[model samples]
Target: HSQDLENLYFQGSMNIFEMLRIDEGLRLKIYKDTEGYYTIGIGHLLTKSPSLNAAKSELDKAIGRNTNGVITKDEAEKLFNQDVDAAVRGILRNAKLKPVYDSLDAVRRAALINMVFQMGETGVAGFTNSLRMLQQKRWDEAAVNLAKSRWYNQTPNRTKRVITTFRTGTWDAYKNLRKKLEQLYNRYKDPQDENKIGIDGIQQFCDDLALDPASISVLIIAWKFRAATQCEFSKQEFMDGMTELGCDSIEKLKAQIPKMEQELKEPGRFKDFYQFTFNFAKNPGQKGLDLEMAIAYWNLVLNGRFKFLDLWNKFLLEHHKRSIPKDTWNLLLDFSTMIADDMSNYDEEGAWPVLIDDFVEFARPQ
Candidate 1:
């Protein structure tokens, strides 16, 4: 029965896992025979049926289901036409083949292509730039492009390290990089295996950044300004300012400034402030009209020139309540007017007079 079983090589007896296992000195092979039976092309089971027909049929059904009738047998075959060996050759054909090349054996190619197949041609073609660079023998450039891509971005650290070797040509340093990648691919492709480490490390890094509102705010502000300013304001300077504000630490400062407490309590306020500041800083060219008028209007407003103006009265009343020291107010007003004049005269326009007149007309509403 054993001899006959060996001779007939019925694939139904052996499980898929046993068929895919790499045995020492046994080369696993896959091929289509004249009888339409798929043969194990390599290994001790070279002439035996290693469930290739069943596997292919299952894969075809999966493809059909995924594509919604779009992928016919011809299309599926074209997609998976390259055998494991040919796929290995394709990986090697990449000019950027480095030590990382040693990592992706036949099994790895099969696994990776399995994923590519699942993702479809458009998804596969998305790696075009990397593949093109590899084909052009620009392995380093190709590798860098690959790492920068969404695929690598989504891959595990171990897989990413292997991919990086392909990018950096550090395969010489990491001898088993390619083989490790193949192992990872094979392990992931198997149905019985549940140890898929999909993108968690990368996602974790993203989550960390997302969780830290202050960090994100600082980053956004930096991006908007193109340089560290205002909020990127030195920690020492911040602490010093807080000290002057009669607070010992940030927590104390937060307590003193109830608005800040409100901002923290309701994140929307901080978000709105960030958005407003971002837009405001983006228009560096637009000088503030209030700042332009502050110097001339300070004296007039204080002397009560516009008594009927409710808004002016309200502003003056607030100014009085704030009890902003005379020196501080004068310093602020002078600094603002100086900035307005500098912005006006820095360029060829020298349009300060026009800007001032526009502000007067708008504010006075006569």
Candidate 2:
């Protein structure tokens, strides 16, 4: 059976060549396959291309460069193997092969990999009953049971071929993200040892991210690392920051951009950032955020995201001209949550400051 499997592989390799008709060793041009899909170089489907704009704006990794251009014979092999290996890894990641499934015979193991490569890992992961039958070594009915699906009915001969058309996958690439952090920090270091950028690094970082030093977006990152002192990031802070972001690389971070913006836009997360902003922006070990600092803090944290910023600023300007107590600053979060986009949820008898109480009354239906 194992010998038969080896023969199957030899035949399959030849079949792929017979089917794809290696377009190089000569000129490569985009053409359609029997399935009515536009393809190039062995079998890269240009129509159903990955990300379509070099995987642009999509959360997919741009796996290969260009299938449209002419390529050398070597380039042809690289392109072909990229798809072949990707499916192999995808199955290894998703398939739970060894609940002792690994102890199976080589024919069965080859069948497992072959079927998964055809169905795609995600597709194979779905056939619980059939896979269980395979796992339990009902190799007799395993082929028969799988023959029942529509996937089997259509392809019959080949189940899956290409891979870059991914499932709605979420890959963290955390190690890669961390590596980028190391790269991003290299130039701005202490100029002494272990070489980590500190205060000097913040501007270029903000510039690269297309944000102001004071932008709430930057503040969320600040909050993540709880940065040593604003404008400074120690090596510890870099490692810590990546850990909290649930990502480590520039690519993953870029992929997470819209999601991060939406995450920052959440009033709940923003509120936490806002409260933390006071301390983060304040002089460390200081009693509280001073009047000047408090105003700037309000401008950053409360200006856009807060609905009642006008009222809050009015109270700050008219009544509370002193350093904002840590109590008042954090309690305001409770105020915002309780307010619930309407003043009706407010409780006058509750222990809000006189300034807030007066501002509420004044801003009340008048």
Candidate 3:
């Protein structure tokens, strides 16, 4: 817990601070470190020091130290700790180890913070294998994990001092992601299917993931993978989707998923993905989605995102029509975004599908 009392002292700061840092009794003209950088006391780098040209003449006298703004010894202590505290809090920002952060004793917490501090937050995070071991409370392995790292290879003494605090800690978040992904793999994958999934594969993936395959939310996932036909999940899509959703939840907790949906709403994204969706679910070389396919896709892709889907589904059935255009499908998404249950804003002027116009009239306030 303590270093040699004198080891903390730096001679360059002698007489200025009775200690290298605290008990500061000296202030004066900025001094250059060995690197030739203009520096204030200790390693604090500096820019312009007002009246520097004159201050050189004044250094031997008391006037030079206070010529421009000067810090109180107490103020120096306060501000330095402010800078130090900022380092830990930032690394801890949205950290998944929050539970462990809560669980650790002060010394153990500070050691991890110290790793994050000097190594740079991302640099320290690169030691995931070690931290993951730490999460397991496998002290010997956690220590071994450190020895395997460049941190240990590069700073052997400090690294030895660090892992001393490595002890029992919590790590539940990523495990949940793994659990969620596994549940999906089992529910959706089929031994007979190439991807072990199909349109049916997706339903369970949605009703849950129930996973009872997921809720209203499952609709968008169904669309995103472009479930081609009934029993349509490509084992690959199912696996990748399962993987993405694994990482997605933690990121989505910060509300990234909505922005993803927003990008899907953007016209450029809409046009491209809409075209791809046609190819995705349609028979190759087909000009458009057949009525049965279009109706089914409308049901999946717009699931719960739209306000007027019930009416749209009815419209699809009423026409019992066949083969939707790429252009028509893209425009259909736009219509879903703008129109409400109310047909009042329905601009006959807009280039909506003819069926939409009729559906609007049919569902209009009568």
Candidate 4:
């Protein structure tokens, strides 16, 4: 019972808890995944049968709107707990896994639970040879066997982490990494809630790091963290993000900022990050950005990258005074790259968004 208790603690804290959260990610809004199925909190598949109904019940508060629904953090947490509990119960109910799961140490047990949680019990139960190797305590061979499977190629990053967890049979590194993250979190956490880093806390954090709140680097940090709201860091977001960046200390995170900023120079990644800004900086639950806020961000995000940015901002300030829709935001970069600053290549019949068409019309010489 003593060892079981320890395993229970390890499973809940490192494997089933943090690893699963990091792997699945936390989303407050209903979203379409790569497979185009509706997904919600911590990768909960909303397109599935009972889970969809259960999500509706949990988020009944936002039921009035069929588009762009959002849920509270507590609601997301509740869904996460239910999903994880189900996965754990499902794994234990498997006769082939129950005995093997009981026989393994905390570290290996977590890797199993993480696997089952990601792919479901039926997925892991198919690992017959790998399970046999685990039963015989052949750690290296088991990792190799698991790595050779299709699951490994599908998500090589996560599969590598799982395999490493199994082979090492310890989470001491992650334990320390999380400890350091908590320490930094506490350093800047809101006084009202130890779990949150709010505006004031972030202000002080910026001062310590000498970062302007409006700078692209800060936006990069927010984008990397997948922060849901501007100037706020939920505890889960901070932990999950730090794990992804592989930074355990403030010094490392600070040093890594320059490298992240450089990523914005790459055309592909910059476009992704640029699109991320519209949602990241928008007011909560709003479908579009306020015009002034969009201009401010345009200046901040498109600094030096878009040569006609100043003129565009000037044009919007004088002619437009409405919220910027998603389509307008998404097309701005294409407009910048395709249309010359002098408006020589502007096409009246092109498929550009109406906002861009209006801007080009306004900029052209009369």
User: Highest TM-score: which candidate?
Assistant: 4
A best-first ranking of the candidates according to their TM-score comes to: 4, 2, 3, 1
Error of 1 at 19 (Å): 16
Residue-level error in angstroms, candidate 3, position 334: 2.2
Select the stronger candidate by lDDT from 2 and 4: 4
Residue 28 shift from truth in candidate 3, angstroms? 61
Candidate 4: deviation at residue 256, Å? 3.3
TM-score of each: 0.21, 0.46, 0.38, 0.61
When summed lDDT is taken over every stretch of 10 residues in candidate 3, the lowest stretch is 16-25
Better of 1 and 4 by lDDT: 4
Candidate 2: worst-modelled 10 consecutive residues by lDDT:
162-171
Model 3 C-alpha lDDT per residue in residues 117-219, reported as the tens digit of each score: 4576778777767676665667788777787777776655345555654643222222343366566466667657545665565565444443333232444
| Residue ranges of candidate 4 with Cα displaced over 4 Å | 1-19, 22-103, 111-177, 265-267, 285-287, 320-322, 351-355
lDDT of 1 at 310: 42
lDDT of 2 by residue, 24-116 (tens): 111144444556554555555555543334322111222245433445444544455556556556555554654423555433444455455
- Top model number, lDDT: 4
lDDT of 1 at 208: 35
lDDT of 4 by residue, 161-255 (tens): 78878888887545654576678889889999887889998887777778998777888988878788895888878877776665666776798
What's model 1's lDDT at 17?
A: 20
- Give the per-residue lDDT of model 1 (tens digit) for 1-366: 222224335543322121122110111223344354543322111124456556455444534443322333233333332343454465456444322345454333333343332343346555666655654557578666666666655443333544544445433313343254344333323233333222332133224334332243433322322232321233223222332343322244334444333443353443334333332322234333233234333433233323223443444444423232223333333223344322332232433343333333343433
Candidate 1 ranges with C-alpha deviation above 4 Å: 1-120, 168-366
Candidate 3: what lDDT? 0.54
